[PDB]
Amino acid sequence: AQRVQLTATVSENQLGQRLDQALAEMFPDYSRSRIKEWILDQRVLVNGKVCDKPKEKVLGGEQVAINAEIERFEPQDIPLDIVYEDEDIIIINKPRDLVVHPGAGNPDGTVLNALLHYYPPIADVPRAGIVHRLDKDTTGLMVVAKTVPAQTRLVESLQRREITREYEAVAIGHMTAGGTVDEPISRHPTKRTHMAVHPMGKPAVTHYRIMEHFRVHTRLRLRLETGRTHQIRVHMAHITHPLVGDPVYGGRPRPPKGASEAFISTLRKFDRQALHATMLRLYHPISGIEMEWHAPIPQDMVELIEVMRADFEEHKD
Amino acid sequence: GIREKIKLVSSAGTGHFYTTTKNKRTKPEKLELKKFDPVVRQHVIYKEAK
Amino acid sequence: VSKSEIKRDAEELKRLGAEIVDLGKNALDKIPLDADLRAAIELAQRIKMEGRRRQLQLIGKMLRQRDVEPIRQALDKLKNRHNQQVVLFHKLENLRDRLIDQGDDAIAEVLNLWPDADRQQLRTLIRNAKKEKEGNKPPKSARQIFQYLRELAENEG
RNA sequence: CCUUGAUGUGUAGGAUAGGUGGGAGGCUUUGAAGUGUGGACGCCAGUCUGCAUGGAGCCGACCUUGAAAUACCACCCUUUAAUGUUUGAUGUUCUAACGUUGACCCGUAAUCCGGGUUGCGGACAGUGUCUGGUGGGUAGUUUGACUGGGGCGGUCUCCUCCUAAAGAGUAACGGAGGAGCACGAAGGUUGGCUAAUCCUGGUCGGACAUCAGGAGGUUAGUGCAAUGGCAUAAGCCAGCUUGACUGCGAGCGUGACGGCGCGAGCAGGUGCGAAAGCAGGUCAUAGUGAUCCGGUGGUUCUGAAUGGAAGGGCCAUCGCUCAACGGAUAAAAGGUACUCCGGGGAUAACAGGCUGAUACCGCCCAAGAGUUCAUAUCGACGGCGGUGUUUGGCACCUCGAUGUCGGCUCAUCACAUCCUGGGGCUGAAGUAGGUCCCAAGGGUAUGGCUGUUCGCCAUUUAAAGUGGUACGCGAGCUGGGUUUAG
RNA sequence: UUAUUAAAAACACAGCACUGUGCAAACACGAAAGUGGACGUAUACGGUGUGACGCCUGCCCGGUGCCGGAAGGUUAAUUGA
């Protein structure tokens, strides 16, 4: 709340137009809809009189006075599962429903806000030391360099594509063999929350392998080169083999023939995206010795592969 | 279009006139032009170019 | 860009010219029309129907070669169909009660913005306006107040 | 509307300042500054005034105001005071018009009507003529021609080059375009001059600044699109200039014609140069509109008895996006699967015969991959052929009728063969296989889904063949899809 | 209900809602008389929408239609300086 008086005089070039617009040009910092709600609140005076009709026509020679309130990111306490912490690097296991960068609607409660609470002066480095983005619905390992010279080496490594990243994913369909996918990608022409494959898009490379199959699903291990927004999902979906439980990019639900009631519940229970990062490899900033870390399989994935293993060993066998 | 059709009346007392077109926008000054007049059988000045 | 695109644009101007001739003599002088066009208007209604077509061809002929928006905009005010005209009357009556009920706090805006306002006569008019309303007399002078403001609205001179 | 006297407070400021000119003075003993009431304006802030008291006088730049005067002389604007003139609007009273599907009496043993009394409205309503507005409720029409599609658009006139086949002309949904102006100079005459591009040199100065010297006599320019021309220059500059004139104009060309263009030369008056001569527009080809009917001027041309006048005629003249541009109205948009009538295969769709753009089939050229080894087996870049059952277009039609998709009954023909039969090769040990050749004698499925053709699935066998039959078969059946009318 | 291809999900239906109507009612039939409404009287008549019953019918007057208000601008017949 910032209670500051706002009084101004309308000119003679706003003739024959409404109330919301007139205050907009003279007050550039506040737009029509912000003005509209305060008009309905009976807190704006025109010619010394309060008005209740925003669609009035005002021309000029009037003194409008707004007597009301007006108004980087506040840190919040979030539980984080620390994997490795020292003076140069920070390895963190990001839990479910936690976005790595706050936006319009999430001022506090994200990774950056939690890192601000975890270490107060962490705001010195840009973006609080995050180097690559990851979906909030997907859990996995995240890397943050503590010191700013490590930031320069890390971003340069990705430009040369030196750091290797590994992912664990569960998809639909009886897979046969691994391979590579190389398809340019750009924004979806119609929907603004989809990043679809486009022939004249940004070039991309992704590799995928398989560890074991299932009834109509699979468990697979793969490596991603470029950590762009939702790269792994579309390249897995461009071969019409969408991820299991993905609501945005995965296909429509398709339970298998003769599926048990418990199996159908698990897909309903597993209502998040099937993605996880297990193994990350990095080069130390000032030492030059490789570090290797592993991420335990999350509990939801443990039961997901368990129910599929029982179903596959019962129906097909 | 932009041109304005004008009439040139003899400076003498006769009513015989000639028809022509002048752009008033670029040449608003009245013309000082003399042309043959059959009624007076001589050459007479023409004025009042609109 | 298209010959027929010009055609409908020209034809739209033709019916606009046909509207001017169908307008009364008293209201004809209101629009800022040139004398050459004005003289052609009076001959247009008195000519026989076939000559009206030729006159309509005439009226369209030299009206296309000049600018049309001020003529159309001025015609719109007289028809009271342009949006800025009706709101101008709205504020013109909006300053009436702002002035007819006080008489002193509203004259400042008029003189500050309009330099052709005769404040010597405006104060006297309000004196009569206050007298008739206070004595519950018929408003025989309230109409003249609006005429003066309306006359000064379009540069009476 | 006619005088009659005041009447105009944003501000500093002696203080209730109206704009346009004269203005340092008019007025007054035909009796004054300044004191009081009466009437009266009136935002009581202030002011005008009959009267006499009074017994001889008032201002103006003054410094300030955007603007300086009750110092005066006028056109006057607004507000408003009091008579007379003219015309409206509103309100009140009454009845005698008019209304009364109020009561009563009579014609009259009558809920019609008329007559009489009274009550209630009342000059209202209502009615008649004209007029403003609304008015597809109703009536008469229009929606032109060229082909396109869910709805809309574009073209119609003129000019340039090619198509155009060496006179002229010559079309297409043939390829490129432009014009509806402009110029009183950018016309005429006279005189004068000749650029692009590049070399060297030269300062700010660069790929132009303007040039000194050079090969080029036009590849530059020619108001604008293109073409043809332009050195006698039509290109460039300067003086004078109006021939961009009036009445003509033999003759020729182009078109069916209206029309359009060239036009020597004659009479008059002109401009240029001394003169010979040129000048009836712009180097030319598009820059446009015939007639009917309108404005102006002239013509005593005519003037429904005489003289005029009105009107009409002739001449010049401005008068079209009449653009649908040889121009049906001055005035007009759409649908009809609710349609009808008279015609048309003069004009679409499916099928039939041209066709192979695209794609299927065969062959050849053979770098390369192939344990050695090209065609044992593939084979990149290309070429030649065939049904042609997809996706298409072309002239031919049955519109005085050519009935479909699919299912049932019925089948027939070709083999580019699904099985059975005879073989070749094999990277064919046998069975089981794969490819190719010959061979059409026979056989070549049952059910759920959907109207299905097709296809998926379930289950058999030797397979559950491919195409023609106008993608067979309604004067054999079916009406499930398509299906007018709800 | 489509006689003579459509018997239905279509029409209608009691109910519900809005609007018009004070009697010489609105409206309709009729150049008009007059008649129906109705020899009824706003718990009545006409028009429109929906269509048992239960829970309900949310927001918006911008354009059109309707009502009221009229401050103002334009505006014919009429009269003739």
Q: Which amino acid is at B18?
A: Y
Q: How far apart are CA B45 and CA C115, in angstroms?
A: 50
- Angle in degrees, CA C57, C63, C64, rounded to 5: 90
Cβ-based neighbour number of residue C6 at 10 Å = 11
Asked whether the beta carbons of C72 and C25 are under 8 A apart, the reply is no
Q: Which residues of A touch C (CB under 8 A)?
A: 12, 15-16, 57, 59-61
Name the token pair of A211: 């560890």
CB-based contact B34:B15 (threshold 8 Å) = no
Tell me which chain C residues have a C-beta less than 8 angstroms from the C-beta of A12: 113
Helix (H) or strand (E) holding C124: helix C119-134
CA distance A205 to A224: 8
Which of C135, C15, C112 has the alpha carbon at shortest distance from C68?
A: C15
**CA distance linking residue A278 with residue A83, whole number of Å:** 12
- Report the residue of chain B nearest C36, measured CA to CA: B4
Say if strands A63-69 and A49-50 run parallel, antiparallel, or are unpaired: unpaired
At B33, give phi and psi (nearest 5°).
-135, 135
- How many CB atoms are closer than 10 A to CB A237? 19
Chain E nucleotides reached by a protein CB under 7 Å? 62, 71-76
Q: What is the DSSP letter of C13?
A: H
Q: Determine whether A97 is exposed, middle or buried from the number of CB atoms within 10 Å of its CB (0-12, 13-18, 19+).
A: exposed
Strands A290-294 and A212-213: unpaired
Closest Cα to residue A137, out of A275, A277, A231, A232?
A275
User: Rounded to whole angstroms, how far apart are CA atoms C46 and C55?
Assistant: 11
What DSSP designation does B35 have?
E
Tell me the C-alpha distance between C117 and C119, whole Å: 6
CA of A94 to C1' of D33 (A): 108
Q: SS3 for chain A, per residue?
A: CCEEEEEEECCCCCCCECHHHHHHHHCCCCCHHHHHHHHHCCCEEECCEECCCCCCCECCCCEEEEEEECCCCCCCCCCCEEEEECCCEEEEEECCCCCCCCCCCCCCCCHHHHHHHHCHHHHHCHHHHECCCCCCCCCEEEEEECCHHHHHHHHHHHHHCCCCEEEEEEEECCCCCCEEECCCECCCCCCCCCCCECCCCECCCEEECCCEECCCEEEEEEEECCCCCCHHHHHHHCCCCCECCCCCCCCCCCCCCCCCHHHHHHHHHCCCCCEECCEEEEECCCCCCEEEEECCCCHHHHHHHHHHHHHHHHHCC
Q: If you count residue pairs, one on A and one on C, with CB atoms under 8 Å apart, how many are there? A: 22
Rounded distance between C-alpha atoms, residue A39 and residue A52, angstroms:
7
- At residue C92, what is the residue type? L
Break sites following residues in chain A (C–N > 2.5 A): 71
Q: CB-based burial of residue B46 (10 Å sphere; 0-12 exposed, 13-18 middle, 19+ buried)?
A: buried
**Contact in structure between A232 and A171 (CB atoms under 8 Å):** no
Q: Is the CB of C93 under 7 A from strand E?
A: yes
CA-nearest residue to C112 within chain A is A61
Residue C63 CB neighbour total at 10 angstroms: 20
CA distance A108 to A76: 6
Amino acid at position A12, single letter: E
Contact A163, A193 (CB under 8 A): no
- Which residues on chain B place their C-beta less than 8 Å from a C-beta of chain C? 1-2
To which residue do tokens 């890390």 refer?
A154
Alpha helices in B1-50 (DSSP H): none
Decide if B2 and C65 are in contact by the 8 Å CB cutoff: yes
How many Å apart are CA C64 and CA C10, to the nearest integer? 8
Interface test with chain A among C73, C77, C80, C90, by most A beta carbons within 10 Å: C90
Distance between CA atoms of C65 and A191, rounded to whole angstroms? 49
What is the experimental method? Answer: cryo-EM
Which parts of C31-118 fold into alpha helices (H)? 35-46, 49-64, 69-78, 83-100, 107-113
Work out the end-to-end distance of chain A between its first and last CA atoms, rounded to an integer number of angstroms: 67
Give the burial class of C5: count Cβ atoms within 10 A of its Cβ; 0-12 exposed, 13-18 middle, 19 or more buried.
exposed
Interchain pair A59, C109: CB under 8 A: no
For residue C137, give the 3-state DSSP assignment.
coil
**Helix or strand (DSSP H, E) at C146:** helix C142-153
- Chains contacting B (3 or more CB pairs within 8 Å): C
Among A12, A15, A46, A51, the strongest candidate for a mutation testing the C interface, having the largest count of C CBs within 10 A, is A15
C-beta atoms of C90 and A15 within 8 A: no
Q: What is the DSSP letter of C2?
A: -
CATH code for the part of the protein at A3-69: 3.10.290.10
Chain C residues touching residue B1 (CB < 8 angstroms) = 62, 64-65
Residue C61's nearest nucleotide, by CA–C1', is D320
The continuous run of DSSP H or E covering B2 comes out as none
Phi-psi category of A248—alpha, beta or left, where left has phi over 0 and alpha has psi -120 to 50?
Answer: alpha
Question: String of b and e for A113-144 (b: at least 16 CB within 10 Å)?
Answer: bbbbebbeebbebeebbbbbebbbbbbbbbbb
Residues A119, A132: contact at Cβ < 8 Å?
A: no
Cβ–Cβ below 8 Å for A16 and C113: no
SS3 B45: strand
Residue C125 to residue B11: CA distance in whole angstroms: 56
Beta bridge partners of A46: A49, A64
Tell me the C-alpha distance between A77 and A110, whole Å: 9
CATH architecture of A81-316: 2-Layer Sandwich (3.30)
Spatial distance between the Cα atoms of A157 and A15, rounded to a whole number of angstroms: 60
Give me the CA C122–C1' D28 separation in Å, rounded.
39
CA separation (Å) from B8 to A288, B3, B37, B49?
101, 15, 11, 6
Rounded-to-integer distance, Cα A217 and Cα A174, Å: 6
Exposure of A121 in the CB half-sphere (CA atoms within 13 A): 2
Q: From the CA atom positions of chain A, what is the Rg in Å?
A: 27
Nucleotide nearest to B4 (CA to C1'): D318
Query: Do residues A122 and A112 make contact, with C-beta atoms less than 8 angstroms apart?
Result: no
Q: What chain C residue is nearest to B4 in terms of C-alpha separation?
A: C62
List the single residue in A with minimal CA-CA distance to C82: A16
Interatomic CA distance for residues A103 and A70, integer angstroms: 21
| Whole-number distance in Å between C26 CA and D4 C1' | 36
Give me B24's structure tokens.
């008033």
Q: Where are the domains of chain A?
A: 3-69, 81-316
Is any atom of nucleic acid chain E found less than 7 Å from the CB of residue C24? Answer: yes
User: Residue A120: left if φ>0, alpha if ψ -120 to 50, beta else—which one?
Assistant: alpha
Local structure of C107: helix, strand or coil:
helix
Distance from C-alpha of A146 to C-alpha of A86, rounded to nearest angstrom: 8
Q: Name A280's Cβ contacts closer than 8 Å, sequence gap at least 6.
A: A91, A141, A143, A163, A164, A165, A166, A292, A293, A295
Kindly list the residues from chain B whose CB atom is less than 8 angstroms away from the CB atom of residue C64: 1
Rounded Cα gap, residues C41 and C55, in angstroms:
8
Collapse the DSSP code of C126 into the 3-class scheme (helix H, G, I; strand E, B; otherwise coil) and give the result: helix
Strand partners, A130: A144
> Which of helix, strand or coil describes residue C17?
helix
Q: Do chains A and B touch (3 or more CB pairs under 8 A)?
A: no
Domain boundaries, chain B: 1-50
Q: A66 is written with which tokens?
A: 């707004």
Burial class of A262 by CB neighbour count within 10 A (0 to 12, 13 to 18, 19+): exposed
Residue A270 and residue A255: Cα distance in Å, rounded?
13
- Write the burial class of residue A185 (CB in 10 Å: 0-12 exposed, 13-18 middle, 19+ buried): buried
User: Buried b / exposed e across A162-177, counting CB within 10 Å, b at 16+?
Assistant: ebebbbbbbbbbebee
